Amino acid sequence: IRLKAFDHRLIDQSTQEIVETAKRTGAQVRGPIPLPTRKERFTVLISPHVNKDARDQYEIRTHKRVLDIVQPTDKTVDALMKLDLAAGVEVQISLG
Amino acid sequence: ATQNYGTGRRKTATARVFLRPGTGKISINNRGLDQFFGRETARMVVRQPLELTETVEKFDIFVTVVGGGVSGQAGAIRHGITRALIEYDETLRSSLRKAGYVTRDAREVERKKVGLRKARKRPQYS
Amino acid sequence: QVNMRDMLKAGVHFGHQTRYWNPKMGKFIFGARNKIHIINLEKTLPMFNEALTFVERLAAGKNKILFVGTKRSAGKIVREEAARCGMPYVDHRWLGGMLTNYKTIRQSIKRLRDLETQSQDGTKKEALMRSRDLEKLERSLGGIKDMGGLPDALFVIDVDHERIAITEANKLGIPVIGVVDTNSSPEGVDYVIPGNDDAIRAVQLYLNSMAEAVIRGKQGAATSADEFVEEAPA
């Protein structure tokens, strides 16, 4: 299982929404593993007509997060996907 | 047992240092110590905390170091072995706090800032 | 009290010097013995008894009497023979603008009514950051717990030291019970006491008369608190 979102106050708060709501149904799912983080810097110029040394630089992040089942016997999380997706979490399934 | 685990980081390096009783076995990344560090003064700097605590002949030393620069890995071992020597007791604690070996060197590189060219150098005006 | 040996033994007669001097006071002087001015002994006690007459006249009339004159040397008798339910007092320097800027002081007593109770809780240095300010507010606003109205009796123990309160009194029209000396001027004060402020005995024997005359005023007010409702002895 792999998860992609934009802020750690969603994506690392929806794993407990999956770990609790799958281990309850009997199957063993281990602890989630972090991945390296995408970081993209964007330095943009700020003045309309030119004054070059005034700048401003941003950064867009992307948090990744990987789950790991042990015994696949539950289609419970397959129906509870619209619940576990909330606003900006994308879940590609790797049911190991 | 008597295996002792020692880590140490200096200038974005990282060295696994294992320490156990032996007879002068100094091996790093499956290489000899004189062979690994080619023609530098830091061949003796890795021995400087060892010969200070008069244990140069009494241990096996197994070192695995990753990353960093050439003479930055040699500093990682020197900080790394001092943490491995103080797993025993605090008898050699005062022999190394006074020696200035235990403190990790915090001096890391500084980022380029806009307007400037280097970290602090700026172009010439008139 | 009215006794003469209270006046003789306390050290009332002596003045400051002969060059520290004011001829607006010089009507009430007796001599210049050994280059130190001797105040008059015979015009003091008729003035002094009639001052306590109007203290007692106010004290049974449900009002306030204010004790001032904060010197750290000899003002502790003002700290001591006060602090009861009918008389406020002061402990530190008189604040510039109190009777005239009383609207501000109503806002600054709001902090005083909390930081005693706020020290129930007591981070670590953050408790000391607010319990430090409780000492200064106790040093100045501590003697006044009354709020509302203005004090109808200002008892000034030293006129030369505090011209601030006399000016702010006469802008509002409240009686000022001053104790002048040789060098200080007898203007601005209402009921004069031509006395002295150079001994611990004289500053005490002026004030045992004042706090006793308000107890009998409160004893007179307790005599008259039944007169307010019942009319048979009223």
Add this chain to the structure above:
Amino acid sequence: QKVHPNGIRLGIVKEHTSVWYADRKNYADYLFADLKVREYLQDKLKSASVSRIDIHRPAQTARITIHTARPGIVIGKKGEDVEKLRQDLTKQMGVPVHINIEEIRKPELDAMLVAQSVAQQLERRVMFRRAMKRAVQNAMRIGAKGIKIQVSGRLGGAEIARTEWYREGRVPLHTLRADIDYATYEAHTTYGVIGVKVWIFKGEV
């Protein structure tokens, strides 16, 4: 000069107005939808004052929560505007569209709702200060702890660019812990262009 009071606190105080993840091949094909939605909706809802238009993207369609302080004007006789726009938001945004409407109880404590009224008053030829001394005290009988309102522009004069500045209460701006609203709505008079800035300060933490 005074970096924008949302762009320094996205994080510790406020959050985005639109949350959706997108791949690097479709990221710039959802932005151009969501930026000509907001130019569309405010030009239709010029009355029935609108403060915030949030957009979520659930699985494969949409969700929109339009906020008005007067929902009865928009939902008029059971959604005669709601289903009429929901037909026609799909024509700009090919997914099926949800439309949801909440209330903005205490309308005098959000900066967009306040600053739209300033443009209304200053285009009725109301005095530049009698409009605004009353538009701050009304927003101080209930609610906020500090308000700044700057009114800059032509201000009726010949060649005059003065700035009215009136403040009440406490407004910090170098504290990231605080909670500040901000809005700039403009005004087109019969001469000149007047811009209005609002800095409603709600409670801190």
Add this chain to the structure above:
RNA sequence: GCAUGGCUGUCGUCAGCUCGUGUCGUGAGAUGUUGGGUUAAGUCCCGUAACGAGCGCAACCCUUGUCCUUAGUUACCAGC
């Protein structure tokens, strides 16, 4: 761009800039905000016709440096 909004440079990341009520002055003003000590700092302490409040400075945020807990694939190899 000297009809203006918006957005940026500059003095200068320099330590200042103002108000309420009060008193002094015929008035424009002034006092608070000066004095002694001290601070990167109008930062603090003691003083004091002023008592307070705001903007600022500080802290709140990010990152780097130490350790602890939760986590082990695609990362990791001390033991096997």
